[PDB]
Amino acid sequence: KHTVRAAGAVLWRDATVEVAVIHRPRYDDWSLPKGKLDQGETEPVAAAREIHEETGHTAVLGRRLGRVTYPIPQGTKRVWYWAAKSTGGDFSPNDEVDKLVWLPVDAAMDQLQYPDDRKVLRRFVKRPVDTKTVLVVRHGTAGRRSRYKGDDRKRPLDKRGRAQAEALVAQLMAFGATTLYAADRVRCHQTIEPLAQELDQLIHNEPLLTEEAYAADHKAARKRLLEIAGRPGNPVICTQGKVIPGLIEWWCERAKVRPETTGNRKGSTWVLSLSDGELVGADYLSPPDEK
Ligand SMILES: Nc1ncnc2c1ncn2[C@@H]1O[C@H](COP(=O)(O)OP(=O)(O)OP(=O)(O)O)[C@@H](O)[C@H]1O
Numbered sequence: 001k002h003t004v005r006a007a008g009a010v011l012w013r014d015a016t017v018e019v020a021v022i023h024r025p026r027y028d029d030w031s032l033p034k035g036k037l038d039q040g041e042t043e044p045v046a047a048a049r050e051i052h053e054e055t056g057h058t059a060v061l062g063r064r065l066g067r068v069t070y071p072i073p074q075g076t077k078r079v080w081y082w083a084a085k086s087t088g089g090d091f092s093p094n095d096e097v098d099k100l101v102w103l104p105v106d107a108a109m110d111q112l113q114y115p116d117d118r119k120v121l122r123r124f125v126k127r128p129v130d131t132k133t134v135l136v137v138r139h140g141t142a143g144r145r146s147r148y149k150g151d152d153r154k155r156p157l158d159k160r161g162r163a164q165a166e167a168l169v170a171q172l173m174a175f176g177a178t179t180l181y182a183a184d185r186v187r188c189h190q191t192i193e194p195l196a197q198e199l200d201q202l203i204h205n206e207p208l209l210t211e212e213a214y215a216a217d218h219k220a221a222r223k224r225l226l227e228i229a230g231r232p233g234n235p236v237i238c239t240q241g242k243v244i245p246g247l248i249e250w251w252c253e254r255a256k257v258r259p260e261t262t263g264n265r266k267g268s269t270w271v272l273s274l275s276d277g278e279l280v281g282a283d284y285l286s287p288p289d290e291k
C-alpha cells in the first residue's frame with residue numbers, strides 16, 4: 001500500500017522513428033529507462049534526469065504515455081512515462097546499464113520483455129510524437145481571497161507558493177518551455193517569474209485570461225489561447241482556477257482528446273501536446289509539492 005514513485009520515457013530519434021531500449025546486468029532485463037523520484041522532484045524532472053543518467057542523452061519531454069504499477073517489497077512501484085525526443089548525447093556502457101539499442105518500434109516491441117513496457121510503446125505510436133507544447137499553469141498558493149468583490153489584483157504568492165514557483169522551473173524546462181505568458185494578476189506573474197529569470201525572458205501580460213475577463217467574454221479568452229498556441233515555441237500560460245477547467249474542457253471536447261488525469265490545483269500544469277496545430281494530448285500534472 002506504500003507507493004514508490006518513479007518516472008521514465010520512450011526516448012526516440014529521427015513509424016520512421018527509432019526508440020531506445022536498455023539492458024541492465026543486475027536484472028538481465030531489456031526495458032525502457034526509468035527511475036525513482038528524488039526528494040523534491042516531480043515525475044517529468046525525474047524522467048528527464050533518468051534518461052540522461054541511464055542513456056547519456058538530453059531530451060525534451062512531450063506527451064505522457066500512461067502509468068505502470070507493479071508490486072515490490074516496499075509496496076507498489078508506480079511509473080509514469082513520457083515521449084522524449086533526443087536532443088543528443090552518447091551512451092557509454094557501465095555496470096548499471098551495459099547496452100543501449102536504438103530500434104524501430106516493431107523490433108523494440110519484440111526486445112522489450114515487460115508486457116507493461118510494450119503497452120507504453122503501443123501508446124507512443126498511437127499518436128504523433130513530434131509535438132509542440134503549450135503549458136497551462138494554475139498560479140501557486142497566494143493566501144485566501146478577501147471579503148471584497150471579485151478578485152484581488154495584487155495579492156501575492158505566499159511562502160508555499162513562492163517555493164512552488166521555484167519548483168516549477170525544472171518541471172517546465174523539462175518540456176522545452178521557451179516563451180512566457182501570465183494573466184493580468186500579480187500571483188500569476190510571480191508563479192512564472194523564477195522561470196522568467198532562468199530563461200532571461202519577459203512575461204507577456206494577458207488581460208483577456210483573468211477570471212473577470214473569462215466570465216465577461218469567454219470567446220475572446222479561447223481565441224487568445226489559440227493565438228498564443230499558434231506562435232512558434234512552447235508557451236507557458238499562467239492563469240486562474242475559474243479559467244483553466246473551461247479552456248481545457250473546451251479544447252479537449254473539440255479535438256476529441258481524453259485526459260487520463262484531472263485536476264485544477266494551485267501550482268498544477270496542463271501539458272497540451274499539438275501536432276500541426278491539432279491537440280493530441282492533455283496531461284494534468286499535480287503541483288510540484290503534491291502527490
Ligand atoms: N515493468 C515491469 N513490470 C513488472 N516487473 C518489473 C517491471 N520493471 C521491472 N520489474 C522488476 O521489478 C524488480 C525491480 O525492478 P526496478 O526496475 O523497479 O528496480 P530498480 O533497480 O529500483 O530500478 P529503477 O531505479 O530503474 O526504478 C526487478 O526484478 C524487475 O525485473
Ligand SMILES: Nc1ncnc2c1ncn2[C@@H]1O[C@H](COP(=O)(O)OP(=O)(O)OP(=O)(O)O)[C@@H](O)[C@H]1O
Binds near residue numbers: 144151
Ligand atoms: N471573495 C470571493 N469572490 C469570488 N470567488 C471567491 C472568493 N473567495 C474565494 N472564491 C473562490 O474560491 C477559489 C479559490 O479562492 P482562493 O482565495 O483560495 O484562491 P485564489 O488565489 O483567488 O485562486 P484563483 O486566482 O485560481 O481564483 C477562487 O478561484 C474562487 O472560485
Ligand SMILES: [Mg+2]
Binds near residue numbers: 050
Ligand atoms: Mg532505473
